[PDB]
RNA sequence: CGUGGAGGUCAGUGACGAAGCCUAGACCGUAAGGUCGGGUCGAACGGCCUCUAGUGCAGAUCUUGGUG
RNA sequence: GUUCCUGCCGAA
RNA sequence: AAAUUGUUGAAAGGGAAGGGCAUUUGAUCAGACAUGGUGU
């Protein structure tokens, strides 16, 4: 009980927002909540507070991580879905990041098959710049976007697709 | 060499109104060319009488287009003014091609509103011939954008931009891919040095160029997405340059490249553009391409805000923060901005007591980007920084003032604020932070009491968007507070302008007696 | 190594690539000294001039038809 | 060429930003440097005629603090 | 110890 | 106040960070004769 009390407390630790080690914290949260499947009220309380904390973060990879965890914790603990029928999720459905929006939509719809486990180091700002400058080299322009299946295209790159299919010309190089 | 006489101009005008011929047009245009090139350079004509010169300018700009139209009457096609096919049109087209850059020189030499209006009107009646050229149509749109960019008279800028709309909306094909480029390039390089004088003018320039991007849903997406990417390149160049050890260009002070007004002007103009295109009414239940650029713009802005968490550039953070708040207000996108604000609440200015108090003037947070090293660690600067910060929190959490999700949007913030309030030493800051805390709790209670009567769950988006549509946003405890605060801010700015304006008036008095 | 043999021709000395000798200008009165020598000389507004004066100098220079070497300086950047 | 001192002078320059400093930017001079642009700076100072002071480095004995 | 830059005249 | 030390955050990289050279692929900017006249 004391451990879960301290975890529920540390979820409101302000320093967590700027912590490099948020991934370890994500894994620890997943393991803890998985191990506590019997206490339905406690795990539901963690889910609510997790969304509370997520609403005020800037790191996308962490937020996608929490959403993926919640999706998976729903499988082990289906009673978590009762909260959606018995409020915060509306904000993440309207999140600026397309990937976060898709993850939230999948969690609400329950459509889990189209989710790969989010990977830290992806969705980070430097990675977005590396895509957006079009010169990664282990490029976005090199791939031909005239013919890519719409659903196949990842949510993160949709805007890229639009520009290329509008630009024609230097679409594929 | 023929000499301009008040007789000769009178005869040329005499026969202009009745039965003109191409010879007369070339003669008039050559005289016009000499007239406009007198200071800046063989010529068949010589100008000696101010009456003859003024009459030539008058008749040219006001009636040579009329005769040109009468000889080669254009026809309106699909809303566009298009010339017909024929030999006579081609001869007249070369004639307008021999008048165009005299109009360009006049455009480059505009100094007042009425001359701008006359030149622009005469240019207006000569589009359908000059659309056939690209040394002229480009320089035309480049020059009037130059006038729209450099004029200090709001009426001249209004005239230039109204011309840009009227000509652009007619044709949309040759010009529109150049108008947008020229305008936003103005916001890159030929940007006006900021000051309390230029703010309304640059605000008009931005609020105007925003409309042009919105006209063409697809083509705007083609343009802005490229130019915003240019910004990202600089953004990526400075981050790498500062971080890496290479002594190529200014590893330590690379902020100069990106922490400039021109760059902030860029990121503000883009937020305005997307906000304009993404408004709910213009959306009209129809997705627009510009919405997909919201994510790139937000990523760039957030990447700029966090690149330096130093007091010297807190004003820069505030401006982009207001821009993001505007974007979220118009589009409804959820921007996380509280993590940034609370992350600055650990600084040495928001936390440590003031060291000096020279009693300098209050800092112009709205119209400046930098602290200037004298306001650092001062009572005035801390008191003004916090004044801005508190109102920014008020705005951001006033966006969701009437939403059902506000309670849980408030809880993590009230807890963290009480943590900071209980540990912060500065008395004035704790008082201001406190006020926001209790009003946040109050609006949380308000929304809770209004939500206890709700039968639909979170999944029903339609009803969730209908919650308290009857209640005005300003009637909520955080609205009713912050709205009043906004007035208490807005009036202040007014009294600044209604003061600074008078200073110049007073200044004018002095040159009257000099 | 610098030396006198490298000296430039007198007819081409002190000439910008535009072909105009640069002359410093502080106010309108000093601008008007270059009224006719527009071919030989081009004006250059001093560093210490305020923005309000620079627009007046530019307007008068355009009226006189004298080339300004550094316009859009402190009214635009670079 | 550059640095100060004084007299005279430009009805000089200045919050619409003076002086100082930086500027792998543009122009000029063979060069010492000069002018402009930008940055920085945030309240006064500069150009010019005269007389008067007055140009950047090297190295040793070692000394002190501080770090092994 | 060296002695801002350029130039000039010049033994033995 | 410099000089110096430590925690936290971002980035790059590899056992050092590191440069110069070549090729490769790209992105992005500037690029007048507004040629004086005549002719149908
Ligand atoms: Mg200077
Ligand atoms: Mg003196
Ligand atoms: Mg210097
Ligand atoms: Mg040279
Ligand atoms: Mg890393």
Three-class DSSP labels, B407-433: HHHHHHHHHHHHHHHHHCCCHHHHHHH
Q: Please, are residues B126 and B118 in contact by the beta-carbon 8 Å criterion?
A: no
Q: Resolution of the coordinates in A?
A: 4.0
Q: How far apart are CA B428 and CA B350, in angstroms?
A: 10
- For residue B333, the distance in angstroms to the closest alpha carbon of chain A comes to 6
Query: What's the 3-state SS for B358-373?
Result: CCCCCCCCCCCCCCCC
In whole angstroms, E12 C1' to B403 CA is 104
Ligand 4 centre to CA of C70 (Å) is 19
The residue behind tokens 């007619």 is B170
10 Å Cβ neighbour count for B435? 14
* Contact: B191, C78; criterion CB under 8 Å: no
Q: Minimal Cα distance from C39: which residue of B?
A: B41
Structure tokens belonging to residue B146: 């130059």
- Exposed e or buried b per residue across B377-415, where buried means at least 16 C-beta atoms within 10 angstroms of its C-beta: bbbbbbbbbbbbbbbbbbbbbbbbbbbbbbbbbbbbbbe
- Among B121, B122, B141, residue whose Cα is nearest residue B131: B141
Q: Which chains touch B (3 or more CB pairs under 8 A)?
A: A, C
- Among B236, B214, B232, residue whose Cα is nearest residue B223: B214
**Cα separations in angstroms, A158 against A113, A161, B58, B112, B298:** 19, 5, 55, 47, 15
Distance of CA A30 to the CA centre of its chain: 14
Q: What's phi and psi for C24, nearest 5 deg?
A: -70, 140
Q: How far apart are CA B511 and CA B327, in angstroms?
A: 45
Kindly tell me the number of DSSP H helices and DSSP E strands found in chain C.
Answer: 2, 2
Ligand 3 centre to CA of A52 (Å) is 57
- Among A84, A2, A79, residue whose Cα is nearest residue A39: A79
From the list C38, C65, C76, the residue facing B191 with the nearest CB is C76
| Alpha helix segments (H runs only) across B151-260 | 154-171, 176-188, 199-215, 217-243, 255-258
First to last CA, chain C: 33
Q: What's phi and psi for B242, nearest 5 deg?
A: -65, -45
Q: In strand E, which positions have an atom below 7 A from any protein CB?
A: 5-8
Q: Taking CB atoms and an 8 Å cut-off, how many pairs form between chains A and B?
A: 110
The method recorded for this entry reads: cryo-EM
From the list B40, B152, B190, the residue facing C76 with the nearest CB is B190
List CB contacts of B38: < 8 A, sequence separation 6 or more: B47, C65
10 Å Cβ neighbour count for B21? 11
Structure tokens belonging to residue B475: 């009637």
* Contact: B193, C64; criterion CB under 8 Å: no
* Contact: C77, B262; criterion CB under 8 Å: yes
Q: Which nucleotide across the nucleic acid strands is nearest to C3, CA versus C1'?
A: D30
Q: Please, are residues B276 and B210 in contact by the beta-carbon 8 Å criterion?
A: yes
Distance of CA B482 to the CA centre of its chain: 26
Q: Please, are residues B347 and B311 in contact by the beta-carbon 8 Å criterion?
A: yes
Q: How far apart are CA B377 and CA B382, in angstroms?
A: 7
- Among B377, B351, B257, residue whose Cα is nearest residue B307: B257
List CB contacts of B44: < 8 A, sequence separation 6 or more: B1, B2, B30, B34
Q: How far apart are CA B196 and CA B192, in angstroms?
A: 12
From the list A94, A98, A158, the residue facing B334 with the nearest CB is A94
* Contact: B334, A92; criterion CB under 8 Å: yes
Q: Please, are residues B220 and B172 in contact by the beta-carbon 8 Å criterion?
A: no
Residue C38 in contact with partner chain B when CB distance is under 8 A: yes
Q: How far apart are CA B511 and CA A17, in angstroms?
A: 59
Q: How far apart are CA A12 and CA A57, in angstroms?
A: 12
In whole angstroms, F36 C1' to B43 CA is 6
- Exposed e or buried b per residue across C5-27, where buried means at least 16 C-beta atoms within 10 angstroms of its C-beta: eeeeeeeeeeeeeeebeebebee
* Contact: B303, A129; criterion CB under 8 Å: yes
List CB contacts of B284: < 8 A, sequence separation 6 or more: none
Q: Which residues touch strand E (CB under 7 A)?
A: C 1-5
User: Mutation test of the interface with chain B: which of C37, C53, C77, choosing the one with the most B Cβ atoms within 10 A?
Assistant: C77
Q: Which chains touch C (3 or more CB pairs under 8 A)?
A: B
Distance of CA B212 to the CA centre of its chain: 11
In whole angstroms, E8 C1' to B333 CA is 80
Per DSSP, B356 falls in state B
Q: How far apart are CA B128 and CA B111, in angstroms?
A: 26
* Contact: A14, B342; criterion CB under 8 Å: yes
Per DSSP, A117 falls in state P
Q: Which nucleotide across the nucleic acid strands is nearest to C6, CA versus C1'?
A: D30
Q: How far apart are CA B441 and CA B414, in angstroms?
A: 8
Q: What's phi and psi for C35, nearest 5 deg?
A: -65, -55
* Contact: B40, C65; criterion CB under 8 Å: yes
Rounded to 10 degrees, the C-alpha dihedral B499/B503/B506/B508 comes to -130
Q: Minimal Cα distance from B39: which residue of C?
A: C65
Q: How far apart are CA B142 and CA B300, in angstroms?
A: 28
B13 touches strand D (CB under 7 A): no
Q: How far apart are CA C61 and CA C74, in angstroms?
A: 17
List CB contacts of B390: < 8 A, sequence separation 6 or more: B432, B433, B435, B436
Residue A142 in contact with partner chain B when CB distance is under 8 A: no
How wide is the angle at C-alpha B28 spanned by C-alphas B75 and B156, nearest 5°?
70
Q: Which residues pair with B80 in a beta bridge?
A: B77
- Burial (CB < 10 A; 0-12, 13-18, 19+), residue B8, is middle
The residue behind tokens 């921007």 is B335
Q: What's phi and psi for B313, nearest 5 deg?
A: -125, 15
User: Quick one: chain A helix, strand, coil %, rounded to 5?
Assistant: 60, 0, 40
Residue C37 in contact with partner chain B when CB distance is under 8 A: no
* Contact: A129, B289; criterion CB under 8 Å: no
Per DSSP, A11 falls in state T
Query: Coil, strand, or helix at residue B327?
Result: helix
Q: How far apart are CA B179 and CA A152, in angstroms?
A: 36
Q: Please, are residues B59 and B8 in contact by the beta-carbon 8 Å criterion?
A: no
Q: Please, are residues A96 and B333 in contact by the beta-carbon 8 Å criterion?
A: yes
| Alpha helix segments (H runs only) across B87-136 | 87-97, 100-108, 113-124, 127-130
Q: How far apart are CA B400 and CA B467, in angstroms?
A: 12
10 Å Cβ neighbour count for C31? 22
Q: Minimal Cα distance from B343: which residue of A?
A: A18
Q: How far apart are CA B465 and CA B458, in angstroms?
A: 10
A vs C contact (3+ beta-carbon pairs below 8 A): no
- B276-279, Cβ contacts within 8 angstroms, sequence gap of 24 or more: B276/B210, B276/B211, B276/B213, B276/B214, B276/B330, B277/B213, B277/B214, B277/B217, B277/B220, B278/B327, B278/B330, B278/B331, B279/B330
Q: In strand D, which positions have an atom below 7 A from any protein CB?
A: 11-19, 24, 27-31, 35-43
Residue A145 in contact with partner chain B when CB distance is under 8 A: no
Q: How far apart are CA B90 and CA B72, in angstroms?
A: 9
* Contact: B236, A133; criterion CB under 8 Å: yes
Which residue, counting CA atoms, is nearest to the C1' of nucleotide D13? C48
Kindly tell me the number of DSSP H helices and DSSP E strands found in chain B.
Answer: 23, 4
* Contact: B152, C64; criterion CB under 8 Å: no
The residue behind tokens 């963290």 is B416
Structure tokens belonging to residue A79: 């009673």
Please state whether B361 falls in left (phi above 0), alpha (psi between -120 and 50) or beta. beta
10 Å Cβ neighbour count for B224? 24
Cβ neighbours of B39 in C, within 8 Å = 38, 64-65
B352 touches strand F (CB under 7 A): no
In whole angstroms, D33 C1' to B491 CA is 54
Query: What's the 3-state SS for B466-497?
Result: CCCCCCCHHHCHHHHHHHHHHHHHHHHHHHHH
Q: Which residues pair with B81 in a beta bridge?
A: B76
Q: Taking CB atoms and an 8 Å cut-off, how many pairs form between chains B and C?
A: 27
In whole angstroms, E12 C1' to C5 CA is 30
Q: Cβ within 7 Å of strand F: which of B 118-137?
A: 135-136
Structure tokens belonging to residue B85: 């096919």
- For residue A50, the distance in angstroms to the closest alpha carbon of chain B comes to 10
Q: How far apart are CA A64 and CA A62, in angstroms?
A: 6
């Amino acid at each position: 009980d004391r451990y879960y009390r301290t975890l529920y407390e540390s979820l409101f630790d302000p320093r967590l927002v700027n912590s490099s080690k948020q991934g370890i914290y994500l894994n620890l949260l997943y393991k803890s909540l998985k191990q506590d499947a019997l206490n339905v009220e406690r795990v539901e309380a963690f889910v609510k507070r997790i969304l509370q904390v997520c609403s005020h973060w800037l790191n996308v990879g962490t937020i996608t991580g929490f959403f993926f965890l919640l999706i998976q914790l729903a499988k082990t603990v289906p009673q978590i879905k009762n909260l959606l029928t018995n409020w915060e999720i509306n904000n993440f459905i309207n999140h600026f990041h397309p990937t976060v929006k898709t993850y939230a939509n999948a969690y609400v719809t329950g459509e889990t098959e189209q989710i790969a486990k989010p990977d830290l180091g992806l969705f980070t700002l430097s990675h977005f710049l590396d895509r957006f400058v079009y010169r990664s080299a282990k490029p976005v322009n090199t791939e031909d976007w005239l013919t890519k299946k719409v659903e196949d295209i990842k949510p993160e790159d949709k805007f890229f697709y639009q520009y290329f299919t509008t630009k024609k010309t230097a679409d594929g190089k | 060499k023929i000499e301009l006489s008040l007789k000769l101009v009178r005869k040329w005008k005499k026969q202009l109104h009745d039965s003109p011929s191409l010879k007369l047009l070339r003669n008039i245009i050559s005289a016009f060319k000499v007239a406009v090139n007198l200071n800046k350079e063989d010529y068949k004509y010589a100008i000696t009488d101010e009456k003859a010169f003024h009459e030539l300018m008058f008749m040219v700009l006001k009636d040579v287009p009329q005769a040109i139209q009468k000889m080669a009457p254009y026809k309106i096609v699909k809303g566009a003014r298009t010339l017909p096919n024929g030999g006579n049109v081609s001869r007249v087209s070369s004639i307008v091609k021999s008048h165009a850059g005299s109009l360009l020189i006049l455009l480059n030499d505009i100094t007042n509103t009425e001359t701008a209006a006359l030149v622009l009107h005469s240019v207006n009646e000569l589009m359908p011939y000059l659309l056939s050229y690209r040394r002229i149509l480009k320089e035309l749109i480049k020059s009037i954008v130059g006038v729209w960019s450099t004029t200090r008279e709001l009426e001249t800028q209004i005239a230039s931009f109204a011309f840009l709309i009227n000509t652009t909306k007619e044709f949309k094909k040759s010009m529109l891919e150049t108008t947008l480029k020229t305008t936003y390039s103005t916001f890159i390089k030929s940007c006006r040095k900021t000051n309390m004088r230029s703010m309304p003018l640059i605000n008009f320039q931005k609020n105007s160029a925003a409309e042009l991007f919105g006209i063409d849903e697809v083509l705007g997406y083609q343009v802005g997405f490229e130019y915003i990417r240019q910004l990202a390149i600089h953004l990526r160049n400075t981050m790498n340059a500062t971080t890496k050890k290479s002594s190529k260009i200014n590893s330590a002070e690379a902020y100069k490249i990106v922490y400039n007004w021109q760059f902030c002007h860029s990121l503000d103009f883009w937020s305005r553009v997307l906000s304009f295109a993404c408004q709910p009414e213009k959306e009209n239940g129809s997705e627009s391409p510009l919405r997909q650029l919201i994510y790139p713009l937000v990523q760039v802005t957030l990447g700029v805000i966090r690149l330096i968490p130093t007091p010297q550039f807190f004003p820069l953070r505030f401006y982009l923060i207001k821009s993001l708040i505007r974007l979220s207000q118009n589009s409804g996108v959820f921007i996380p901005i509280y993590p940034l604000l609370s992350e600055i609440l650990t600084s040495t200015a928001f936390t440590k007591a003031p060291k000096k108090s020279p009693n300098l003037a209050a800092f112009d947070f709205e119209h400046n980007i930098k602290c200037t090293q004298a306001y650092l660690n001062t009572k005035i600067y801390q008191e003004g920084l916090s004044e801005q910060f508190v109102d920014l929190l008020g705005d951001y959490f006033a966006l969701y003032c009437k939403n059902i999700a506000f309670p849980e949007l408030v809880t993590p913030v009230i807890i963290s604020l009480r943590r900071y309030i209980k540990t912060s030493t500065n008395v004035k800051l704790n008082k201001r932070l406190s006020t926001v805390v209790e009003k946040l709790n109050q609006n949380s209670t308000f929304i809770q009491e209004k939500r206890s009567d709700v039968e639909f769950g979170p999944t029903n988006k339609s009803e969730v968007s209908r919650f308290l549509n009857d209640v005005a946003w300003n009637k909520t405890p955080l609205g009713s507070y912050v709205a009043v605060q906004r007035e208490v801010k807005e009036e202040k700015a007014r009294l600044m302008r209604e003061s600074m304006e008078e200073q110049d008036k007073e200044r004018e008095t002095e040159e009257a007696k000099l | 190594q610098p030396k006198i043999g490298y000296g430039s021709n007198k007819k081409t000395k002190f000439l910008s690539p535009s072909g105009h000798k640069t002359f410093l200008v502080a106010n309108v009165k000093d601008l008007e000294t270059l009224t006719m020598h527009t071919k030989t000389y081009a004006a250059e507004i001093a560093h210490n001039i305020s923005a309000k004066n620079r627009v007046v100098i530019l307007a008068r220079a355009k009226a006189l038809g004298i080339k300004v070497t550094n316009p859009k300086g402190r009214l635009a950047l670079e």
